[PDB]
Design an enzyme around this catalytic site. Structure first.
Site, PDB file in Angstrom:
ATOM      1  N   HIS A   2      23.842  38.297  42.766  1.00 19.57           N
ATOM      2  CA  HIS A   2      24.482  38.191  41.464  1.00 19.57           C
ATOM      3  C   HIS A   2      23.499  37.700  40.418  1.00 19.57           C
ATOM      4  CE1 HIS A   2      27.922  37.655  38.700  1.00 19.57           C
ATOM      5  NE2 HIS A   2      28.581  38.373  39.589  1.00 19.57           N
ATOM      6  N   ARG A  44      25.587  45.780  39.226  1.00 22.17           N
ATOM      7  CA  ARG A  44      25.145  44.429  39.546  1.00 22.17           C
ATOM      8  C   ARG A  44      23.753  44.386  40.166  1.00 22.17           C
ATOM      9  NH1 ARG A  44      30.732  42.840  40.816  1.00 22.17           N
ATOM     10  NH2 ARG A  44      31.329  41.063  39.501  1.00 22.17           N
ATOM     11  N   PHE A  96      35.482  46.092  32.225  1.00 22.24           N
ATOM     12  CA  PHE A  96      34.346  45.618  33.040  1.00 22.24           C
ATOM     13  C   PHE A  96      33.243  46.675  32.991  1.00 22.24           C
ATOM     14  CE2 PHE A  96      35.886  42.255  36.339  1.00 22.24           C
ATOM     15  CZ  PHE A  96      35.786  41.295  35.362  1.00 22.24           C
ATOM     16  N   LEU A 130      29.012  29.919  39.877  1.00 25.19           N
ATOM     17  CA  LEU A 130      29.123  31.221  39.243  1.00 25.19           C
ATOM     18  C   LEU A 130      29.838  31.122  37.904  1.00 25.19           C
ATOM     19  CD1 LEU A 130      28.674  34.319  39.735  1.00 25.19           C
ATOM     20  CD2 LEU A 130      31.056  34.378  40.463  1.00 25.19           C
ATOM     21  N   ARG A 171      28.903  47.250  45.381  1.00 29.38           N
ATOM     22  CA  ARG A 171      30.286  46.960  45.033  1.00 29.38           C
ATOM     23  C   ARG A 171      30.467  47.014  43.525  1.00 29.38           C
ATOM     24  NH1 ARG A 171      33.412  42.521  43.265  1.00 29.38           N
ATOM     25  NH2 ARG A 171      31.618  41.097  43.217  1.00 29.38           N
ATOM     26  N   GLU A 213      31.288  37.622  35.114  1.00 27.98           N
ATOM     27  CA  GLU A 213      30.753  38.697  34.292  1.00 27.98           C
ATOM     28  C   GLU A 213      31.769  39.214  33.283  1.00 27.98           C
ATOM     29  OE1 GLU A 213      31.417  42.257  34.580  1.00 27.98           O
ATOM     30  OE2 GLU A 213      32.986  42.050  36.094  1.00 27.98           O
ATOM     31  N   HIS A 268      25.788  36.886  46.418  1.00 25.30           N
ATOM     32  CA  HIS A 268      27.188  36.964  46.020  1.00 25.30           C
ATOM     33  C   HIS A 268      28.099  37.564  47.079  1.00 25.30           C
ATOM     34  CE1 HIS A 268      30.344  36.869  42.962  1.00 25.30           C
ATOM     35  NE2 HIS A 268      30.721  38.055  43.401  1.00 25.30           N
ATOM     36  N   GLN A 292      24.586  41.887  48.188  1.00 25.48           N
ATOM     37  CA  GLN A 292      24.590  41.978  46.736  1.00 25.48           C
ATOM     38  C   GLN A 292      24.190  40.650  46.113  1.00 25.48           C
ATOM     39  OE1 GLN A 292      27.972  42.258  44.209  1.00 25.48           O
ATOM     40  NE2 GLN A 292      27.547  44.377  43.634  1.00 25.48           N
TER      41      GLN A 292
HETATM   42  C1  LIG Z   1      32.857  33.749  46.079  1.00 22.50           C
HETATM   43  C2  LIG Z   1      33.395  34.595  44.954  1.00 22.50           C
HETATM   44  C3  LIG Z   1      33.924  35.837  45.216  1.00 22.50           C
HETATM   45  C4  LIG Z   1      34.433  36.649  44.189  1.00 22.50           C
HETATM   46  C5  LIG Z   1      34.394  36.179  42.863  1.00 22.50           C
HETATM   47  C6  LIG Z   1      33.848  34.909  42.614  1.00 22.50           C
HETATM   48  C7  LIG Z   1      33.358  34.124  43.629  1.00 22.50           C
HETATM   49  C8  LIG Z   1      32.784  32.767  43.323  1.00 22.50           C
HETATM   50  N1  LIG Z   1      34.845  36.918  41.801  1.00 22.50           N
HETATM   51  C9  LIG Z   1      35.368  38.095  42.076  1.00 22.50           C
HETATM   52  C10 LIG Z   1      35.868  38.885  41.024  1.00 22.50           C
HETATM   53  O1  LIG Z   1      35.850  38.513  39.862  1.00 22.50           O
HETATM   54  N2  LIG Z   1      36.391  40.115  41.329  1.00 22.50           N
HETATM   55  C11 LIG Z   1      36.427  40.588  42.589  1.00 22.50           C
HETATM   56  O2  LIG Z   1      36.921  41.696  42.755  1.00 22.50           O
HETATM   57  N3  LIG Z   1      35.967  39.864  43.630  1.00 22.50           N
HETATM   58  C12 LIG Z   1      35.457  38.674  43.390  1.00 22.50           C
HETATM   59  N4  LIG Z   1      34.969  37.909  44.430  1.00 22.50           N
HETATM   60  C13 LIG Z   1      35.017  38.428  45.808  1.00 22.50           C
HETATM   61  C14 LIG Z   1      36.357  38.195  46.469  1.00 22.50           C
HETATM   62  O3  LIG Z   1      36.937  37.005  45.975  1.00 22.50           O
HETATM   63  C15 LIG Z   1      36.210  38.041  47.981  1.00 22.50           C
HETATM   64  O4  LIG Z   1      35.404  39.080  48.481  1.00 22.50           O
HETATM   65  C16 LIG Z   1      37.565  38.080  48.681  1.00 22.50           C
HETATM   66  O5  LIG Z   1      38.469  37.274  47.929  1.00 22.50           O
HETATM   67  C17 LIG Z   1      37.504  37.582  50.105  1.00 22.50           C
HETATM   68  O6  LIG Z   1      38.852  37.508  50.645  1.00 22.50           O
HETATM   69  P1  LIG Z   1      39.073  37.669  52.220  1.00 22.50           P
HETATM   70  O7  LIG Z   1      40.528  37.687  52.520  1.00 22.50           O
HETATM   71  O8  LIG Z   1      38.256  38.827  52.665  1.00 22.50           O
HETATM   72  O9  LIG Z   1      38.450  36.310  52.791  1.00 22.50           O
HETATM   73  P2  LIG Z   1      38.656  34.780  52.384  1.00 22.50           P
HETATM   74  O10 LIG Z   1      39.333  34.777  51.063  1.00 22.50           O
HETATM   75  O11 LIG Z   1      37.351  34.079  52.501  1.00 22.50           O
HETATM   76  O12 LIG Z   1      39.655  34.217  53.499  1.00 22.50           O
HETATM   77  C18 LIG Z   1      39.229  34.212  54.878  1.00 22.50           C
HETATM   78  C19 LIG Z   1      40.016  33.211  55.687  1.00 22.50           C
HETATM   79  O13 LIG Z   1      39.595  33.300  57.063  1.00 22.50           O
HETATM   80  C20 LIG Z   1      39.911  32.105  57.725  1.00 22.50           C
HETATM   81  N5  LIG Z   1      38.919  31.904  58.756  1.00 22.50           N
HETATM   82  C21 LIG Z   1      37.573  32.103  58.642  1.00 22.50           C
HETATM   83  N6  LIG Z   1      36.925  31.836  59.750  1.00 22.50           N
HETATM   84  C22 LIG Z   1      37.912  31.451  60.645  1.00 22.50           C
HETATM   85  C23 LIG Z   1      37.865  31.047  61.989  1.00 22.50           C
HETATM   86  N7  LIG Z   1      36.743  30.965  62.694  1.00 22.50           N
HETATM   87  N8  LIG Z   1      39.037  30.734  62.583  1.00 22.50           N
HETATM   88  C24 LIG Z   1      40.162  30.823  61.865  1.00 22.50           C
HETATM   89  N9  LIG Z   1      40.324  31.189  60.598  1.00 22.50           N
HETATM   90  C25 LIG Z   1      39.145  31.496  60.042  1.00 22.50           C
HETATM   91  C26 LIG Z   1      39.834  31.001  56.678  1.00 22.50           C
HETATM   92  O14 LIG Z   1      40.952  30.151  56.761  1.00 22.50           O
HETATM   93  C27 LIG Z   1      39.800  31.738  55.335  1.00 22.50           C
HETATM   94  O15 LIG Z   1      40.845  31.247  54.510  1.00 22.50           O
END
Ligand SMILES: *Cc1cc2c(cc1C)nc1c(=O)[nH]c(=O)nc-1n2C[C@H](O)[C@H](O)[C@H](O)COP(=O)(O)OP(=O)(O)OC[C@H]1O[C@@H](n2cnc3c(N)ncnc32)[C@H](O)[C@@H]1O
Ligand SMILES: CCCCCCCC/C=C/CCCCCCCC(=O)OC[C@H](COP(=O)(O)OCCN)OC(=O)CCCCCCC/C=C/CCCCCCCC
Ligand SMILES: CON(C(=O)c1cn(C)nc1C(F)F)[C@@H](C)Cc1c(Cl)cc(Cl)cc1Cl
Ligand code: SF4
Ligand code: F3S
Ligand code: FES
Lengths: 131, 143, 596, 236
Positions: free
Chosen positions: C243, C287, C120, C253, C400, C256, C354, C241
């Site tokens: 993208h 980025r 990367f 998306l 990041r 990269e 992003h 950030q």
């Molecule tokens: C959007 C994205 C991010 C991304 C990526 C490509 C895309 C399209 N590609 C990446 C990559 O190649 N390499 C990398 O290192 N990162 C990459 N990213 C970023 C990364 O995927 C995210 O930053 C990370 O996966 C986020 O995970 P996290 O555990 O922090 O959060 P989540 O996966 O969104 O899950 C959150 C959960 O919370 C629950 N939730 C939310 N609000 C509530 C409320 N109010 N009550 C109860 N539960 C709640 C949800 O259920 C959710 O599942």
């Protein structure tokens, strides 16, 4: 038929319970899958060497064809019972329709005994009503 | 006795679970060649199985309840009840219900060795079956 | 009148993503009684969309020591990251991937039978003076997809009580400590009260406060707004950030990794971005130096377009056997939403939002922070912990690095499970509290349900997304930022006349998408205030009027307080850690001029 | 000049349960919309009737949460294109033969309880000595292709007539492919217990090879071939 009382809405509990599977009962599992393929590999060639001939089949060869065709038609009605008259919904009326296929397939084995010793055969009867 | 009072959750949810409807399953699904040709396979064996359990039980009960029934006496009773149409409606329908179950049985032999189970082979051993019931089905109608 | 249901646990985890699932069976294995409240099913989160890799120094290709990996993370962060969570994340990085392979994550394999690693941008060898190192440790182009479905399956081996489809409303505080969380059952319409000792927040980012984002539809900030309602600060909210690989119109998306294997951006004139508006590193850079290389390139009339405002990234030079083996996901994603071709014709490209490098301020072990009212030192909130994307450990700092956010979940979800095991005895009596605990968060559920105003929920949400795209852009100045604070205050004052049509409690999706608008206005009225109060150019915050980076006056984080919507926002600052966990194991890295 | 389609959405409302489920029809301006069906279901919720309930998360086709019945087949509503024709109409239904919660939201609670029973985790016994990863050759890796890419949308389970009736006992084609992902994994030392919960009458042997599931999988997988490889595994 009467209907046993059912679950209120399909499910009972939370999404973190589990469906506990019934124990290993191979005589309706993999061994029942053997008998469905033995009878289906024996009515496919014998019906081919009953369309190429020009008269009544040989009396020893017809009894082999007419008892393999009872197993092919019993194993079909065994699957239309298990799919539609289940034991969840009806209960004891699942094993009453299985008993009706018991003495409706051994009297149907007596009819093959009164067809290969008196008359010409099963396939001789089908040629008789023509087709 | 604080988290095992979540059976006050099951008594309010199971009053809401009893008024839920079931979505329509037939009468909205589109007609495909997967679930039509597999329905004519099970319809064929049910109708021809009833034509095998009603001509063998008849000779079986005559062997115990003594009446005597030759195949000639059965034929003279079956050829007098009906005529024209009926005999050419039973003969023309049952001749096509046998060709679609003969070619169906050989088709399910290939599928049980995990061959031709791609979506290309499902529509390839299913188009060669439709023409097969229109050739061998008519040959059994000139005999 | 509603009827409340009481629960009683040890540790309540809010969220079931990638870092809420790792900390759920990390605590239920040690001998505790946990619960994992989620709004979606666990294999539906936003971490199923990740398609890059998980950076680690495992050894399988060339030679790699984690101390080279540490320097590439501090250099790619403009020295705003705390240099002991960098020391802790890259040291426990080889140990955390081998443990992920033993769970059953199906990794791509090499010729002798080891894990496959691509390359990367940003990660080099020999302390910045060398070649591109191969440390990415990645499962084709569905790495986030095959990471949930293993972590969710291992969470079913140990007894963890999942509470699927429960919307959490607020926090329960009594005399300045968190004692649980009140939730809302969507299937039934009952209000639940969870009581615990150590509440953990892993909800996620607030990317849906902008117009063109790459995030999900549910990806709103409900952890950063539950914390801000209790009276606790948020940190570094102005570093967003952008993208450089977002499709026009939809906002989806392309990864990269296609640029890591030979992706080349071709403008209208067909000239290569190397010397005009580009650094010495061609395309495998940060980025933000490439998003600034695009945002002014389409402005100067050099890009392609009917409205002259997008680009395309060429993938046609690669062999056809390299696309269909390493990236099959992009070969079908750009064929539907873009709809021209992936291999023989290129695809449109716009800058989209992003990632968010901010949130709840925590330490390196997971426990959240506030500051003292008179001495200005840190202080630990008793009970509140945070991990994932909704927590500012400042591993990313001001920028990041590529594919360090999936290593963020595995390491700092594993560390949260270890620090509760050093403090909490399994099995303790809960203190008796009054029965009106949380009565101020049920009366907000009823005010937003029996509503009758002049503006609907989908009309106010369009005035917020349009405002945040024009003013808090890639390029900011102190004449549009001060109009972006003035406009975002005018939309919040019209939240008193919101209109709601559904008056039921069973799956009121008009209520749930109105509570997500109350949480978005709290994370959008502090981004605009904090961005208009940093006169500096570092990371993803580039000011036109102040084009110089500061290492003497502006090397500090920004904390922000806001009680409810339509309430003033205040600011204080805290000092950045510049020392390591141990001086002999790894020396600290001094600040220099950042240039790629 | 505005173009108008006619979207017909199945509607039910649980606080008035004496009413019957019926179809409601909207007139969507086709110029002010996207090219997908989800983009024409969100426009109805904003500028028109806002009591319409459905599930959506990612608008991309990788989450598996817009499963409904659009036109007759089961597909994901974020990657199905609208027919650009203002003369013909469109009927939007939920997944067939499920207990319906509000409008287009089924009750997928039996589906999650069946996925937990196949034990979807690795069950190795003895790990390497030095503490590194588990060796696996490239030809043993290629066996897993087309099996770990399932997104658990249940569009294949609710298209099988054998699952329409006997769904409290038969696992369905979506779960039985995930019972095959752990059967041909090379690093799995527990396979004599996985082929003992499928050896009864209705867990696996309700498959009659009526291959609807392969036909209506929106990811191009083969959940029907992976059932007829389990039957050969139990027999021989
Ligand atoms: C959007 C994205 C991010 C991304 C990526 C490509 C895309 C399209 N590609 C990446 C990559 O190649 N390499 C990398 O290192 N990162 C990459 N990213 C970023 C990364 O995927 C995210 O930053 C990370 O996966 C986020 O995970 P996290 O555990 O922090 O959060 P989540 O996966 O969104 O899950 C959150 C959960 O919370 C629950 N939730 C939310 N609000 C509530 C409320 N109010 N009550 C109860 N539960 C709640 C949800 O259920 C959710 O599942
Ligand atoms: C109306 C008969 C009622 C008795 C059985 C109930 C119906 C069962 C199926 C009846 C329809 C198909 C059977 C008859 C159609 C075949 C046409 C026919 O028989 O016409 C007479 C014709 C005479 O010509 P040949 O001299 O023999 O040949 C000369 C060679 N050049 O005979 C034949 O064609 C061959 C006889 C076919 C016997 C097939 C046995 C039918 C019984 C099937 C019962 C259930 C079997 C299920 C499917 C079996 C195959 C998988
Ligand atoms: C898809 O066809 N139908 C099956 O119900 C079916 C067919 N096969 C091969 N398997 C199944 C499943 F039920 F196990 C139904 C729709 C038609 C049908 C019926 Cl309702 C009743 C009867 Cl006795 C025969 C038939 Cl043909
Ligand atoms: S296997 Fe196919 S039909 Fe089944 S859930 Fe996965 S994508 Fe859907
Ligand atoms: S349609 Fe059903 S019967 Fe088998 S081939 Fe698919 S699970
Ligand atoms: S909404 Fe994520 S797949 Fe259609």
């Amino acid at each position: 038929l009467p209907v046993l009382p059912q679950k209120p809405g399909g499910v009972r509990g939370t999404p973190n319970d589990a469906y506990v599977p019934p124990p290993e009962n191979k005589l309706e599992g993999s061994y029942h899958w053997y008998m469905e393929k033995i009878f289906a590999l024996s009515v496919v060639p014998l019906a081919t060497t009953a369309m190429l001939t020009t008269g009544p089949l040989s009396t020893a060869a017809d009894s082999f064809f007419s008892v393999m065709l009872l197993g092919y038609c019993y194993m079909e009605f065994n699957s239309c019972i298990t799919d539609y008259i289940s034991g969840r919904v009806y209960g004891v009326w699942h094993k009453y329709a299985m008993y009706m296929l018991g003495l409706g397939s051994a009297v149907s084995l007596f009819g093959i005994y009164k067809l290969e010793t008196e008359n010409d055969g099963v396939v001789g009867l089908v040629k008789s009503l023509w087709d | 006795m604080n988290t095992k009072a979540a059976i006050a959750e099951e008594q309010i949810l199971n009053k809401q679970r009893a008024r839920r409807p079931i979505s329509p399953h037939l009468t909205i699904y589109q007609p495909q060649l997967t679930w039509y040709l597999s329905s004519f396979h099970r319809i064929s064996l049910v109708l021809m199985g009833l034509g095998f359990y009603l001509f063998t039980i008849l000779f079986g009960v005559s062997g115990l309840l003594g009446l005597g029934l030759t195949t000639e006496k059965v034929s003279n009773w079956y050829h007098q009840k009906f005529s024209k149409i009926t005999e050419w409606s039973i003969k023309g329908s049952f001749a096509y219900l046998f060709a679609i179950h003969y070619g169906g049985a050989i088709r399910h032999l290939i599928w049980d060795t995990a061959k031709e189970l791609t979506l290309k082979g499902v529509y390839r051993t299913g188009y060669a079956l439709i023409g097969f019931t229109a050739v061998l089905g008519t040959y059994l109608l000139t005999l | 009148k509603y009827h409340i249901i009481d629960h009683e646990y040890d540790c309540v985890v809010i969220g079931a993503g990638g870092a809420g699932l790792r900390a759920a069976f990390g605590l239920a294995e040690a001998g505790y009684k946990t619960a994992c409240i989620s709004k979606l099913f666990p294999t539906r989160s936003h971490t199923v969309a990740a398609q890059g890799g998980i950076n680690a120094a495992l050894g399988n290709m060339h030679k790699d020591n984690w101390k080279w990996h540490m320097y590439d993370t501090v250099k790619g962060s403009d020295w705003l990251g705390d240099q002991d969570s960098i020391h802790y994340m890259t040291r426990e990085a080889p140990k955390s991937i081998i443990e992920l392979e033993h769970y059953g994550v199906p990794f791509s394999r090499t010729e002798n039978g080891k894990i496959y690693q691509r390359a990367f941008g940003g990660q080099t060898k020999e302390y910045g003076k060398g070649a591109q190192a191969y440390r990415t440790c990645a499962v084709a182009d569905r790495t986030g997809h095959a990471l949930l479905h293993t972590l969710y399956g291992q969470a079913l081996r140990h007894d963890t009580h999942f509470f699927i489809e429960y919307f959490a409303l607020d926090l329960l505080t009594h005399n300045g400590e968190v004692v649980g969380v009140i939730a809302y059952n969507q299937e039934d319409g009952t209000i639940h009260r969870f009581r615990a000792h150590k509440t953990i927040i892993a909800t996620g980012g607030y990317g849906r406060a902008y117009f063109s984002c790459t995030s999900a539809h549910t990806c709103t900030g409900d952890g950063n707004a539950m914390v801000s309602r209790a009276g606790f600060p948020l940190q570094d909210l102005e570093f967003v950030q952008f993208h450089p690989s977002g499709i026009y119109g939809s906002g989806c998306l392309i990864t990269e990794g296609a640029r890591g294997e030979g992706g080349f951006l071709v403008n209208s004139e067909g000239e290569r971005f190397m010397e005009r508006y580009a650094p010495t590193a061609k395309d495998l850079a940060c980025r933000d130096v490439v998003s600034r290389a695009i945002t002014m390139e389409i402005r100067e009339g050099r890009g392609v377009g009917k409205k002259k405002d997008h680009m395309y990234l060429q993938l046609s030079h690669l062999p056809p056997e390299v696309l269909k083996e390493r990236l099959p996901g992009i070969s079908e994603t750009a064929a539907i939403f873009a709809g021209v071709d992936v291999t023989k014709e290129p695809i449109p490209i716009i800058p989209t939002v992003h990632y968010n490098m901010g949130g709840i301020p925590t330490k390196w072990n997971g426990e959240a922070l506030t500051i003292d009212e008179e001495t200005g030192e840190d202080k630990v909130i008793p009970g509140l912990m945070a991990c994932g994307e909704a927590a500012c450990v400042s591993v990313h700092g001001a920028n990041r690095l590529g594919a360090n956010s999936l290593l963020d979940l595995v390491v700092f979800g594993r560390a949260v499970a270890h620090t509760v095991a050093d403090t909490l005895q399994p099995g303790l009596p809960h203190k008796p509290l009054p029965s009106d605990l949380g009565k101020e968060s049920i009366a907000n559920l009823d005010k937003l349900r029996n509503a009758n105003g002049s503006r609907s929920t989908a009309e106010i949400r369009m005035n917020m997304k349009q405002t945040m795209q024009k003013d808090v852009s890639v390029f900011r100045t102190q004449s549009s930022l001060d109009e972006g604070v003035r406009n975002i205050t005018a939309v919040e004052k019209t939240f008193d006349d919101v209109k709601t049509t559904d008056r039921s409690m069973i799956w009121n999706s008009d209520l749930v998408e109105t509570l997500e608008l109350q949480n978005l206005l709290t994370c959008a009225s502090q981004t605009a205030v904090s961005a208009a109060n940093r006169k500096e150019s570092r990371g993803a915050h580039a000011r036109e009027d102040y084009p110089n980076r500061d290492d003497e006056h502006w090397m500090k984080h920004t904390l922000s307080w806001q009680k409810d919507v339509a309430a003033p926002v205040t600011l204080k600052y805290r000092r950045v850690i510049d020392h390591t966990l141990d001086e002999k194991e790894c020396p600290s890295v001094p600040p220099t001029v950042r240039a790629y | 000049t505005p173009r108008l389609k006619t979207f017909k959405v199945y509607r039910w409302n649980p606080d008035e349960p004496s009413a019957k489920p019926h179809l409601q029809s909207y007139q969507v301006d086709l110029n002010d919309c996207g090219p997908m069906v989800l983009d024409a279901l969100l426009k109805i919720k904003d500028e028109q009737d806002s009591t319409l309930t459905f599930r959506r998360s990612c608008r991309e086709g990788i989450c598996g949460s817009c499963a409904m019945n659009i036109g007759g087949r089961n597909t994901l509503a974020c990657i199905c294109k609208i027919d650009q024709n203002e003369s013909k109409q469109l009927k939007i239904y939920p997944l067939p033969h499920m207990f319906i919660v509000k409008d287009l939201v089924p009750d997928l609670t039996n589906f999650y309880q069946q996925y937990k029973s196949i034990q979807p985790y690795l069950q190795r016994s003895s790990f390497p000595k030095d503490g590194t990863e588990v060796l696996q050759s490239i030809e043993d890796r290629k066996k897993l292709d087309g099996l770990y890419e399932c997104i658990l949308c249940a569009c294949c389970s609710t298209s099988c007539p054998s699952y329409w009736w006997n769904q409290e006992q038969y696992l369905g084609p979506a779960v039985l492919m995930q019972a095959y992902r752990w059967l041909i994994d090379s690093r799995d030392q527990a396979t004599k217990t996985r082929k003992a919960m499928l050896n009864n009458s209705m867990s696996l042997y309700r498959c009659h090879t009526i291959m609807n599931c392969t036909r209506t999988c929106p990811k191009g997988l083969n959940p029907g071939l992976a059932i007829a490889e389990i039957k050969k595994s139990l027999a021989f």
